[PDB]
């Protein structure tokens, strides 16, 4: 009984849904249990590696808060009195022993206070980055769709052997719809592994997709991503934050 | 796509292959080296190199240009001047054609904002929307539109196409609420009563020729006939139209929304409308 | 590894303890209660009656309206006398 | 002589520890979660620069405004002096005017 | 003091939408505003110009330095070079010489020197995109 | 038990057209069977899964969408692939007597 998935969201009349093999983790050789149609505007978009770079750098930096601070000549202890008179000493003119020139003095232009590098790319840009990441994985044959993440056993050895047999990458990012419903078998299998990382659908991000060689998705996660990312296309300009009630937005 | 095929042929995209789009990242210029060192582009002595040149607008001691010009009330009271966003009939027709504004229901500021036909900023002294004669010649939609200001030609076009136009005042608070009702409903305050126009605007909204919401309804037919005669079209008897009730629906002068009355509380969480029953509260909210 | 549980908004209304000195004052007034009612609905646990003004508040609002917002008849009379004086 | 005569101890970096492996997760919490949480709410750090950025003067002003009352005496004196100096520098000194 | 009721229809009416509605079907085109739906089936050309989320042709005027006037056809899919050839052929008789253009293949955009937004929009409507 | 890792090498069978047309008859028959459109997901899956199980070589997801016709499937299954290491390729590329290649990996 093939697991055949069709695209629920409307597809552009000039584009045909891309296709992928729906697999299953229940067995080593279960490499083809169905056929899934993925939306072309999500899984066959332009390969904009520039946007990939933009989103990856945003993810790396916007959370960054450097805690490096140096004491300026005003904050270094002491250094109030003039070391010696202006004239007659035959020495260089100075006004305090804590100026940037002196040993143990202040830092003229150093890191000042905890600095934030926070900046937000447009949500459309970030959604497009997610789409481009998915398209890159699919085009480079690193995307593997699954019917479900249910494993026959919780042994990490089984998962590693399955990945090696299927010729997956050294690192696999497995994705499930929601955190709560993630199968206990896969939870146990991935809790002990380091290069196999299990995340909910809401946790998908460009940086992790790039860090992990292969991306494993389930059919409900595929539908979730399609809906969420396609909404950004054809959404209005916001009247107010989308957290607030809207006529048709969940 | 050929790009996707090239991806298939190329190595894996990872965090070690990313490059910014050329031209997006300008090189940073810092004062080290022969070309950018030494005086570091600051000049030679004077105030410029010392970083102590006089403030902007200073002219070396000569009476500055921006001070030797006499003061004139160009911007006197700018923060108190009322502003009305223009809504051309071209824009209205575009919205109606694209379905962003539904002409089968009474069109008002809330519906325009929801359709994104106009962006109101009550904090920036915007007092509403003014109809504009632009696009009048090619305007064909029949609609019941309520605005704040309206031009004679815009009114003529709306009425010629069988529609109805009324000018309704909105004080800043009611304007903010009507433009963004959902945030107000989340504030949890009871719906306030729309305030009357300021004395200066009272004669405008009490005039039939402007289709004021506070004008005598008995004077509307004469004004409509005058516009029809002036602009050379036959006044359509909307009372015989199938949408006559919708065209006639006009909210009460003290009412912000169509159905909701002042004083009600909209509990959106459980889809309810709490209506006060205290006699004093009812009297105040009906005042 | 497995990702930590996704962050979620604290479900239901949040009622800070008034006794605590560090609780901001804006979280203790009636406006906060009204906002909680509007957002979380009947689960807020706040009596809906408090939403409308208390009788003293109603008296103050009515007095303020009488003071600053004149009635339509008064506005029209003022306009009429102004026009007569100007003419 | 400012150069060490021995190779520094080898530095081993675990590229697949928990932090690196799960870095970036929930950065799309907003767009992928009905916008219930803004990604800026994932920033853990000083209260006065959570989801906010500015130059040194702006950062100092925000710090004094938000946590100034809770700062130590000498730290607050230093912050006031830094704000004063930065005001003078940014509003009275520079190449462009 | 309190009295709850269910008249939430007037609140649902005020609730704004988040998704751009599909344009209503009109008996006659072009609409009084001039809008015309994309032709179905799509034109059989090497390239495709996807409409904007507003259902408008993605041709935009642009200006830089206060004197460089340009027109950008943005949402192009397919043979952007075929689109460049077609635009050059269409515009050369009007302008008097072959127009100067930049083909940003990565972004799938075509930037032409000079303001030709209206002519290009009409031409794309004729082509059916 | 994990089956032994499969070799990615795949030499197209000589009876490729006969095998493919037999599978086409099994799944879907008409003249010009090479032009049978694979637009139905059920039939596409049946044919491709049968071909993969038989030949040991499967269509990658990247090429799955472009395999629109039986002709495209035939093209994909008649283009060969090899998995020998670069060392093996260089050493078997007829190295001249004065060129010695060694791997310390
Ligand atoms: Mg000192
Ligand atoms: Mg000194
Ligand atoms: Mg020191
Ligand atoms: Mg030089
Ligand atoms: Mg010098
Ligand atoms: Mg000099
Ligand atoms: Mg003088
Ligand atoms: Mg521009």
PDB file of N, CA and C in Angstrom, chain B residues 66-128:
ATOM      1  N   UNK B  66      20.503  80.271   8.635  1.00  0.00           N
ATOM      2  CA  UNK B  66      19.265  79.837   9.264  1.00  0.00           C
ATOM      3  C   UNK B  66      18.847  80.720  10.433  1.00  0.00           C
ATOM      4  N   UNK B  67      19.551  81.820  10.689  1.00  0.00           N
ATOM      5  CA  UNK B  67      19.195  82.716  11.784  1.00  0.00           C
ATOM      6  C   UNK B  67      18.965  84.118  11.241  1.00  0.00           C
ATOM      7  N   UNK B  68      19.579  84.439  10.105  1.00  0.00           N
ATOM      8  CA  UNK B  68      19.371  85.747   9.499  1.00  0.00           C
ATOM      9  C   UNK B  68      18.109  85.807   8.649  1.00  0.00           C
ATOM     10  N   UNK B  69      17.402  84.694   8.486  1.00  0.00           N
ATOM     11  CA  UNK B  69      16.126  84.676   7.777  1.00  0.00           C
ATOM     12  C   UNK B  69      15.021  84.912   8.800  1.00  0.00           C
ATOM     13  N   UNK B  70      14.072  85.812   8.546  1.00  0.00           N
ATOM     14  CA  UNK B  70      13.049  86.099   9.554  1.00  0.00           C
ATOM     15  C   UNK B  70      12.187  84.883   9.853  1.00  0.00           C
ATOM     16  N   UNK B  71      11.702  84.820  11.087  1.00  0.00           N
ATOM     17  CA  UNK B  71      10.780  83.763  11.474  1.00  0.00           C
ATOM     18  C   UNK B  71       9.418  84.007  10.839  1.00  0.00           C
ATOM     19  N   UNK B  72       8.847  82.959  10.252  1.00  0.00           N
ATOM     20  CA  UNK B  72       7.516  83.028   9.676  1.00  0.00           C
ATOM     21  C   UNK B  72       6.741  81.788  10.090  1.00  0.00           C
ATOM     22  N   UNK B  73       5.432  81.954  10.257  1.00  0.00           N
ATOM     23  CA  UNK B  73       4.601  80.874  10.746  1.00  0.00           C
ATOM     24  C   UNK B  73       4.300  79.820   9.702  1.00  0.00           C
ATOM     25  N   UNK B  74       5.340  79.283   9.064  1.00  0.00           N
ATOM     26  CA  UNK B  74       5.132  78.226   8.080  1.00  0.00           C
ATOM     27  C   UNK B  74       4.559  76.976   8.733  1.00  0.00           C
ATOM     28  N   UNK B  75       5.142  76.559   9.855  1.00  0.00           N
ATOM     29  CA  UNK B  75       4.768  75.323  10.531  1.00  0.00           C
ATOM     30  C   UNK B  75       4.070  75.590  11.861  1.00  0.00           C
ATOM     31  N   UNK B  76       3.449  76.756  12.002  1.00  0.00           N
ATOM     32  CA  UNK B  76       2.732  77.080  13.229  1.00  0.00           C
ATOM     33  C   UNK B  76       1.486  76.213  13.337  1.00  0.00           C
ATOM     34  N   UNK B  77       1.361  75.490  14.446  1.00  0.00           N
ATOM     35  CA  UNK B  77       0.200  74.651  14.651  1.00  0.00           C
ATOM     36  C   UNK B  77       0.161  73.413  13.791  1.00  0.00           C
ATOM     37  N   UNK B  78       1.305  72.981  13.259  1.00  0.00           N
ATOM     38  CA  UNK B  78       1.314  71.800  12.404  1.00  0.00           C
ATOM     39  C   UNK B  78       0.796  70.579  13.152  1.00  0.00           C
ATOM     40  N   UNK B  79       1.161  70.442  14.427  1.00  0.00           N
ATOM     41  CA  UNK B  79       0.719  69.302  15.218  1.00  0.00           C
ATOM     42  C   UNK B  79      -0.759  69.368  15.564  1.00  0.00           C
ATOM     43  N   UNK B  80      -1.423  70.489  15.290  1.00  0.00           N
ATOM     44  CA  UNK B  80      -2.851  70.625  15.522  1.00  0.00           C
ATOM     45  C   UNK B  80      -3.661  70.687  14.237  1.00  0.00           C
ATOM     46  N   UNK B  81      -3.009  70.764  13.079  1.00  0.00           N
ATOM     47  CA  UNK B  81      -3.725  70.705  11.813  1.00  0.00           C
ATOM     48  C   UNK B  81      -4.215  69.288  11.563  1.00  0.00           C
ATOM     49  N   UNK B  82      -5.490  69.158  11.215  1.00  0.00           N
ATOM     50  CA  UNK B  82      -6.039  67.848  10.904  1.00  0.00           C
ATOM     51  C   UNK B  82      -5.528  67.372   9.552  1.00  0.00           C
ATOM     52  N   UNK B  83      -5.233  66.079   9.465  1.00  0.00           N
ATOM     53  CA  UNK B  83      -4.776  65.455   8.235  1.00  0.00           C
ATOM     54  C   UNK B  83      -5.743  64.351   7.843  1.00  0.00           C
ATOM     55  N   UNK B  84      -6.069  64.288   6.556  1.00  0.00           N
ATOM     56  CA  UNK B  84      -6.938  63.253   6.014  1.00  0.00           C
ATOM     57  C   UNK B  84      -6.197  62.542   4.895  1.00  0.00           C
ATOM     58  N   UNK B  85      -6.053  61.233   5.020  1.00  0.00           N
ATOM     59  CA  UNK B  85      -5.396  60.464   3.976  1.00  0.00           C
ATOM     60  C   UNK B  85      -6.262  60.481   2.720  1.00  0.00           C
ATOM     61  N   UNK B  86      -5.694  60.719   1.539  1.00  0.00           N
ATOM     62  CA  UNK B  86      -6.518  60.718   0.326  1.00  0.00           C
ATOM     63  C   UNK B  86      -6.856  59.305  -0.121  1.00  0.00           C
ATOM     64  N   UNK B  87      -8.089  59.131  -0.593  1.00  0.00           N
ATOM     65  CA  UNK B  87      -8.545  57.871  -1.173  1.00  0.00           C
ATOM     66  C   UNK B  87      -9.142  58.189  -2.537  1.00  0.00           C
ATOM     67  N   UNK B  88      -8.327  58.070  -3.579  1.00  0.00           N
ATOM     68  CA  UNK B  88      -8.800  58.335  -4.926  1.00  0.00           C
ATOM     69  C   UNK B  88      -9.837  57.302  -5.346  1.00  0.00           C
ATOM     70  N   UNK B  89     -10.794  57.749  -6.159  1.00  0.00           N
ATOM     71  CA  UNK B  89     -11.746  56.812  -6.736  1.00  0.00           C
ATOM     72  C   UNK B  89     -11.031  55.745  -7.551  1.00  0.00           C
ATOM     73  N   UNK B  90      -9.865  56.071  -8.110  1.00  0.00           N
ATOM     74  CA  UNK B  90      -9.058  55.053  -8.773  1.00  0.00           C
ATOM     75  C   UNK B  90      -8.667  53.955  -7.793  1.00  0.00           C
ATOM     76  N   UNK B  91      -8.188  54.344  -6.609  1.00  0.00           N
ATOM     77  CA  UNK B  91      -7.817  53.358  -5.602  1.00  0.00           C
ATOM     78  C   UNK B  91      -9.029  52.560  -5.147  1.00  0.00           C
ATOM     79  N   UNK B  92     -10.166  53.231  -4.960  1.00  0.00           N
ATOM     80  CA  UNK B  92     -11.367  52.521  -4.532  1.00  0.00           C
ATOM     81  C   UNK B  92     -11.805  51.502  -5.576  1.00  0.00           C
ATOM     82  N   UNK B  93     -11.783  51.886  -6.853  1.00  0.00           N
ATOM     83  CA  UNK B  93     -12.135  50.952  -7.915  1.00  0.00           C
ATOM     84  C   UNK B  93     -11.153  49.794  -7.976  1.00  0.00           C
ATOM     85  N   UNK B  94      -9.862  50.075  -7.804  1.00  0.00           N
ATOM     86  CA  UNK B  94      -8.863  49.012  -7.795  1.00  0.00           C
ATOM     87  C   UNK B  94      -9.147  48.015  -6.678  1.00  0.00           C
ATOM     88  N   UNK B  95      -9.426  48.524  -5.477  1.00  0.00           N
ATOM     89  CA  UNK B  95      -9.723  47.649  -4.350  1.00  0.00           C
ATOM     90  C   UNK B  95     -10.980  46.828  -4.604  1.00  0.00           C
ATOM     91  N   UNK B  96     -12.031  47.466  -5.120  1.00  0.00           N
ATOM     92  CA  UNK B  96     -13.275  46.749  -5.384  1.00  0.00           C
ATOM     93  C   UNK B  96     -13.048  45.667  -6.429  1.00  0.00           C
ATOM     94  N   UNK B  97     -12.294  45.989  -7.481  1.00  0.00           N
ATOM     95  CA  UNK B  97     -12.039  45.023  -8.541  1.00  0.00           C
ATOM     96  C   UNK B  97     -11.243  43.836  -8.022  1.00  0.00           C
ATOM     97  N   UNK B  98     -10.286  44.082  -7.132  1.00  0.00           N
ATOM     98  CA  UNK B  98      -9.482  43.005  -6.574  1.00  0.00           C
ATOM     99  C   UNK B  98     -10.136  42.343  -5.369  1.00  0.00           C
ATOM    100  N   UNK B  99     -11.320  42.794  -4.968  1.00  0.00           N
ATOM    101  CA  UNK B  99     -12.052  42.142  -3.903  1.00  0.00           C
ATOM    102  C   UNK B  99     -11.554  42.450  -2.513  1.00  0.00           C
ATOM    103  N   UNK B 100     -10.599  43.367  -2.377  1.00  0.00           N
ATOM    104  CA  UNK B 100     -10.093  43.740  -1.066  1.00  0.00           C
ATOM    105  C   UNK B 100     -11.069  44.621  -0.301  1.00  0.00           C
ATOM    106  N   UNK B 101     -12.011  45.255  -0.994  1.00  0.00           N
ATOM    107  CA  UNK B 101     -13.086  46.014  -0.369  1.00  0.00           C
ATOM    108  C   UNK B 101     -14.394  45.520  -0.972  1.00  0.00           C
ATOM    109  N   UNK B 102     -15.286  45.006  -0.124  1.00  0.00           N
ATOM    110  CA  UNK B 102     -16.517  44.387  -0.595  1.00  0.00           C
ATOM    111  C   UNK B 102     -17.594  45.451  -0.758  1.00  0.00           C
ATOM    112  N   UNK B 103     -18.065  45.734  -1.976  1.00  0.00           N
ATOM    113  CA  UNK B 103     -19.085  46.777  -2.145  1.00  0.00           C
ATOM    114  C   UNK B 103     -20.492  46.336  -1.782  1.00  0.00           C
ATOM    115  N   UNK B 104     -20.711  45.052  -1.497  1.00  0.00           N
ATOM    116  CA  UNK B 104     -22.034  44.573  -1.120  1.00  0.00           C
ATOM    117  C   UNK B 104     -22.391  44.905   0.321  1.00  0.00           C
ATOM    118  N   UNK B 105     -21.427  45.329   1.125  1.00  0.00           N
ATOM    119  CA  UNK B 105     -21.634  45.724   2.506  1.00  0.00           C
ATOM    120  C   UNK B 105     -21.224  47.178   2.687  1.00  0.00           C
ATOM    121  N   UNK B 106     -21.746  47.856   3.708  1.00  0.00           N
ATOM    122  CA  UNK B 106     -21.368  49.260   3.918  1.00  0.00           C
ATOM    123  C   UNK B 106     -19.866  49.388   4.112  1.00  0.00           C
ATOM    124  N   UNK B 107     -19.247  50.225   3.290  1.00  0.00           N
ATOM    125  CA  UNK B 107     -17.808  50.442   3.344  1.00  0.00           C
ATOM    126  C   UNK B 107     -17.535  51.627   4.254  1.00  0.00           C
ATOM    127  N   UNK B 108     -16.627  51.443   5.206  1.00  0.00           N
ATOM    128  CA  UNK B 108     -16.224  52.516   6.098  1.00  0.00           C
ATOM    129  C   UNK B 108     -14.725  52.393   6.342  1.00  0.00           C
ATOM    130  N   UNK B 109     -14.232  53.180   7.296  1.00  0.00           N
ATOM    131  CA  UNK B 109     -12.797  53.236   7.534  1.00  0.00           C
ATOM    132  C   UNK B 109     -12.258  51.885   7.984  1.00  0.00           C
ATOM    133  N   UNK B 110     -13.014  51.167   8.816  1.00  0.00           N
ATOM    134  CA  UNK B 110     -12.573  49.843   9.242  1.00  0.00           C
ATOM    135  C   UNK B 110     -12.381  48.923   8.047  1.00  0.00           C
ATOM    136  N   UNK B 111     -13.351  48.907   7.131  1.00  0.00           N
ATOM    137  CA  UNK B 111     -13.248  48.023   5.975  1.00  0.00           C
ATOM    138  C   UNK B 111     -12.103  48.439   5.064  1.00  0.00           C
ATOM    139  N   UNK B 112     -11.910  49.743   4.867  1.00  0.00           N
ATOM    140  CA  UNK B 112     -10.791  50.195   4.046  1.00  0.00           C
ATOM    141  C   UNK B 112      -9.463  49.760   4.654  1.00  0.00           C
ATOM    142  N   UNK B 113      -9.308  49.943   5.964  1.00  0.00           N
ATOM    143  CA  UNK B 113      -8.066  49.550   6.622  1.00  0.00           C
ATOM    144  C   UNK B 113      -7.868  48.043   6.523  1.00  0.00           C
ATOM    145  N   UNK B 114      -8.939  47.273   6.729  1.00  0.00           N
ATOM    146  CA  UNK B 114      -8.828  45.820   6.650  1.00  0.00           C
ATOM    147  C   UNK B 114      -8.419  45.379   5.253  1.00  0.00           C
ATOM    148  N   UNK B 115      -8.957  46.031   4.228  1.00  0.00           N
ATOM    149  CA  UNK B 115      -8.543  45.767   2.869  1.00  0.00           C
ATOM    150  C   UNK B 115      -7.216  46.375   2.495  1.00  0.00           C
ATOM    151  N   UNK B 116      -6.615  47.150   3.397  1.00  0.00           N
ATOM    152  CA  UNK B 116      -5.310  47.767   3.162  1.00  0.00           C
ATOM    153  C   UNK B 116      -5.364  48.767   2.015  1.00  0.00           C
ATOM    154  N   UNK B 117      -6.527  49.389   1.816  1.00  0.00           N
ATOM    155  CA  UNK B 117      -6.633  50.464   0.851  1.00  0.00           C
ATOM    156  C   UNK B 117      -6.075  51.781   1.337  1.00  0.00           C
ATOM    157  N   UNK B 118      -5.975  51.962   2.651  1.00  0.00           N
ATOM    158  CA  UNK B 118      -5.445  53.186   3.231  1.00  0.00           C
ATOM    159  C   UNK B 118      -4.768  52.833   4.545  1.00  0.00           C
ATOM    160  N   UNK B 119      -3.734  53.594   4.888  1.00  0.00           N
ATOM    161  CA  UNK B 119      -2.987  53.412   6.128  1.00  0.00           C
ATOM    162  C   UNK B 119      -3.166  54.666   6.972  1.00  0.00           C
ATOM    163  N   UNK B 120      -3.928  54.549   8.048  1.00  0.00           N
ATOM    164  CA  UNK B 120      -4.227  55.677   8.921  1.00  0.00           C
ATOM    165  C   UNK B 120      -3.251  55.675  10.086  1.00  0.00           C
ATOM    166  N   UNK B 121      -2.777  56.865  10.456  1.00  0.00           N
ATOM    167  CA  UNK B 121      -1.873  57.059  11.587  1.00  0.00           C
ATOM    168  C   UNK B 121      -2.494  58.105  12.503  1.00  0.00           C
ATOM    169  N   UNK B 122      -3.404  57.699  13.390  1.00  0.00           N
ATOM    170  CA  UNK B 122      -4.018  58.681  14.296  1.00  0.00           C
ATOM    171  C   UNK B 122      -3.005  59.417  15.148  1.00  0.00           C
ATOM    172  N   UNK B 123      -1.907  58.761  15.526  1.00  0.00           N
ATOM    173  CA  UNK B 123      -0.877  59.433  16.304  1.00  0.00           C
ATOM    174  C   UNK B 123      -0.216  60.557  15.524  1.00  0.00           C
ATOM    175  N   UNK B 124      -0.264  60.509  14.193  1.00  0.00           N
ATOM    176  CA  UNK B 124       0.292  61.555  13.345  1.00  0.00           C
ATOM    177  C   UNK B 124      -0.774  62.543  12.889  1.00  0.00           C
ATOM    178  N   UNK B 125      -1.783  62.778  13.725  1.00  0.00           N
ATOM    179  CA  UNK B 125      -2.820  63.776  13.483  1.00  0.00           C
ATOM    180  C   UNK B 125      -3.674  63.451  12.267  1.00  0.00           C
ATOM    181  N   UNK B 126      -3.630  62.216  11.780  1.00  0.00           N
ATOM    182  CA  UNK B 126      -4.581  61.807  10.758  1.00  0.00           C
ATOM    183  C   UNK B 126      -5.971  61.743  11.373  1.00  0.00           C
ATOM    184  N   UNK B 127      -6.937  62.376  10.715  1.00  0.00           N
ATOM    185  CA  UNK B 127      -8.306  62.421  11.200  1.00  0.00           C
ATOM    186  C   UNK B 127      -9.247  61.542  10.393  1.00  0.00           C
ATOM    187  N   UNK B 128      -8.736  60.796   9.419  1.00  0.00           N
ATOM    188  CA  UNK B 128      -9.564  59.910   8.629  1.00  0.00           C
ATOM    189  C   UNK B 128      -9.174  59.880   7.168  1.00  0.00           C
TER     190      UNK B 128
END
